[PDB]
Amino acid sequence: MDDANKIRREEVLVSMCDQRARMLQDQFSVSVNHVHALAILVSTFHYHKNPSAIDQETFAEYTARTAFERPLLSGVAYAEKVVNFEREMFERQHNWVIKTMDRGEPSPVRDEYAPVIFSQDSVSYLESLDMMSGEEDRENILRARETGKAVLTSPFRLLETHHLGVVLTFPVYKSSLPENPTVEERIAATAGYLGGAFDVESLVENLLGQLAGNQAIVVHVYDITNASDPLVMYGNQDEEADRSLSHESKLDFGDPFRKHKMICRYHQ
Amino acid sequence: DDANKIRREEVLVSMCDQRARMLQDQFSVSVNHVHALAILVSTFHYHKNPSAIDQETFAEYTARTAFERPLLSGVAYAEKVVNFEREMFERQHNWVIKTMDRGEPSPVRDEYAPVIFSQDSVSYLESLDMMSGEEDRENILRARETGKAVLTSPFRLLETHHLGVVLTFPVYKSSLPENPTVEERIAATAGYLGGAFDVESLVENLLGQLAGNQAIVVHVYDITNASDPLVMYGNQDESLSHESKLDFGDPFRKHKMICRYHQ
Numbered sequence: 339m340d341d342a343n344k345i346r347r348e349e350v351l352v353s354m355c356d357q358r359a360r361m362l363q364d365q366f367s368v369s370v371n372h373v374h375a376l377a378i379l380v381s382t383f384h385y386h387k388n389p390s391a392i393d394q395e396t397f398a399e400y401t402a403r404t405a406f407e408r409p410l411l412s413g414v415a416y417a418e419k420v421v422n423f424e425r426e427m428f429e430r431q432h433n434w435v436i437k438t439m440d441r442g443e444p445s446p447v448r449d450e451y452a453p454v455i456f457s458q459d460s461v462s463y464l465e466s467l468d469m470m471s472g473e474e475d476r477e478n479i480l481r482a483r484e485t486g487k488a489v490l491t492s493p494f495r496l497l498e499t500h501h502l503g504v505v506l507t508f509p510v511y512k513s514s515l516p517e518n519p520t521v522e523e524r525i526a527a528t529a530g531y532l533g534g535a536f537d538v539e540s541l542v543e544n545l546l547g548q549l550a551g552n553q554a555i556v557v558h559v560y561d562i563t564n565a566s567d568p569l570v571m572y573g574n575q576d577e578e579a580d581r582s583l584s585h586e587s588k589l590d591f592g593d594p595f596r597k598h599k600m601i602c603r604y605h606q
Numbered sequence: 607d608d609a610n611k612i613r614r615e616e617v618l619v620s621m622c623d624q625r626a627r628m629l630q631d632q633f634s635v636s637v638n639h640v641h642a643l644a645i646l647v648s649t650f651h652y653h654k655n656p657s658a659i660d661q662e663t664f665a666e667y668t669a670r671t672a673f674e675r676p677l678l679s680g681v682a683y684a685e686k687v688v689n690f691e692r693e694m695f696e697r698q699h700n701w702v703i704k705t706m707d708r709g710e711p712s713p714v715r716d717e718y719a720p721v722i723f724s725q726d727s728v729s730y731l732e733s734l735d736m737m738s739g740e741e742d743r744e745n746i747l748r749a750r751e752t753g754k755a756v757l758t759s760p761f762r763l764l765e766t767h768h769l770g771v772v773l774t775f776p777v778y779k780s781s782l783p784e785n786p787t788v789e790e791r792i793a794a795t796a797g798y799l800g801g802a803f804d805v806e807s808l809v810e811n812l813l814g815q816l817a818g819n820q821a822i823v824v825h826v827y828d829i830t831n832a833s834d835p836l837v838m839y840g841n842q843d844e845s846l847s848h849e850s851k852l853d854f855g856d857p858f859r860k861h862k863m864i865c866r867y868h869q
């Protein structure tokens with residue numbers, strides 16, 4: 339109970355919160371970059387090479403051995419764009435039917451689909467599921483292919499684990515993509531999508547929980563894309579925290595469509 | 607005197623520490639992406655039969671991912687070739703193994719490390735024996751004996767003569783036992799993934815233009831031998847200084863950044 343000591347109390351909170359935000363942003367950046375490399379891998383070794391060098395076995399092995407490159411990812415997978423006119427051909431060739439992600443049932447007729455054809459074993463349950471059959475994933479797929487850049491979903495409960503997380507999606511294009519393409523051209527040139535599951539609930543808890551002073555601090559991360567409807571990305575909420583003092587640390591996960599922030603308070 | 611001295615010191619520390627962080631992070635990102643390449647060659651060249659990687663594919667993949675390796679002027683893969691295998695190897699590749707210094711056909715050696723895949727930026731490495739340069743040779747041995755990334759001392763790189771360091775990763779055959787001995791590591795070696803860190807050019811690009819660059823003198827040293835520091839970056843000059851920490855990831859080597867004011 340001292341006014342000089344309270345100034346230092348906030349100083350320590352500022353430093354602790356800022357450090358954790360920097361660690362999170364940096365680890366997400368490293369993960370995004372390594373997912374970009376996988377999109378280029380699929381383009382180079384599956385599409386450009388005649389014949390393809392990538393089968394499910396090969397993708398699984400390579401992504402397992404490189405999992406350390408993608409620290410905030412529980413899994414990565416590649417989904418191919420399939421238009422309805424092609425669906426029966428695609429299914430016959432793969433010897434399986436495109437399924438919905440909610441129940442694993444055969445998909446109803448849709449204009450197009452994004453079935454997962456390659457998966458890291460950690461997310462093997464994605465194989466044959468249509469990634470356009472979840473709304474977060476669908477919206478991400480469209481924005482990925484229309485913008486040509488990595489995009490993030492809003493926070494949602496991931497398949498199987500139900501862990502609160504986000505998905506990162508990169509488009510993969512055909513060689514026919516023109517230089518300086520329009521959005522219409524990007525869509526026409528889309529081959530598929532490289533998706534990575536950021537299991538924030540588990541993997542950020544793992545990151546934060548090992549840090550000295552973790553027991554002293556409450557850390558929440560919000561998606562603040564919509565100012566009037568902030569969305570919990572990480573943290574309880576929802577917790578015994580010091581109401582009288584907080585700090586906002588900045589986060590940039592690199593998708594200009596989305597905005598996020600970190601808020602830290604002391605327990606007591 | 608006096609408060610202005612204290613602030614002058616604080617600015618030096620801040621400027622130097624920030625440059626050190628930027629350099630260490632770019633080096634770290636580079637190393638991690640080179641490691642991924644070593645894993646790629648292992649998976650596609652050795653684990654798949656037949657090989658599912660070739661020069662065309664390696665050149666494309668490495669060109670497209672060059673942005674992932676910011677401090678590297680190029681990357682290449684050299685295969686381990688023991689002398690008994692040389693005839694068959696040269697017949698297969700339709701070229702002769704060459705010396706690094708002259709590009710002359712290699713005299714007989716017990717083994718060699720010819721470059722078989724190369725990013726086009728270092729295309730001139732193709733067919734050169736990386737064991738024919740002493741820095742690279744030492745790095746190759748330590749890479750394969752330790753099973754981890756290793757760095758050379760600073761030296762002038764081929765063609766450009768830019769002062770730099772080489773990063774080398776071992777690639778092993780699938781016959782490598784678990785918890786292998788060094789002898790087992792050697793026997794299981796397939797080859798070596800090497801990346802040329804062009805320090806002279808690419809660190810100058812990183813640091814050289816930053817605000818306040820004209821006010822300070824920046825050096826990076828290899829201090830592996832404390833009594834024989836080797837310049838990795840900066841001039842050859844031998845009061846107010848600051849040492850900022852660097853860790854480039856090879857326990858065999860030590861490095862530091864030193865910054866000073868001019869006057």
Ligand SMILES: O=C(Nc1ccccc1)Nc1cnns1
Binds near residue numbers: 414415416534
């Ligand atoms: O994994 C994807 N999406 C995706 C996968 C591949 C390609 C594009 C997107 N979404 C998931 C939801 N729950 N766990 S993973």
Ligand SMILES: O=C(Nc1ccccc1)Nc1cnns1
Binds near residue numbers: 728731772
């Ligand atoms: O490029 C390598 N070394 C290397 C290449 C491939 C595998 C192992 C080592 N050394 C170079 C010196 N000057 N420019 S590059």
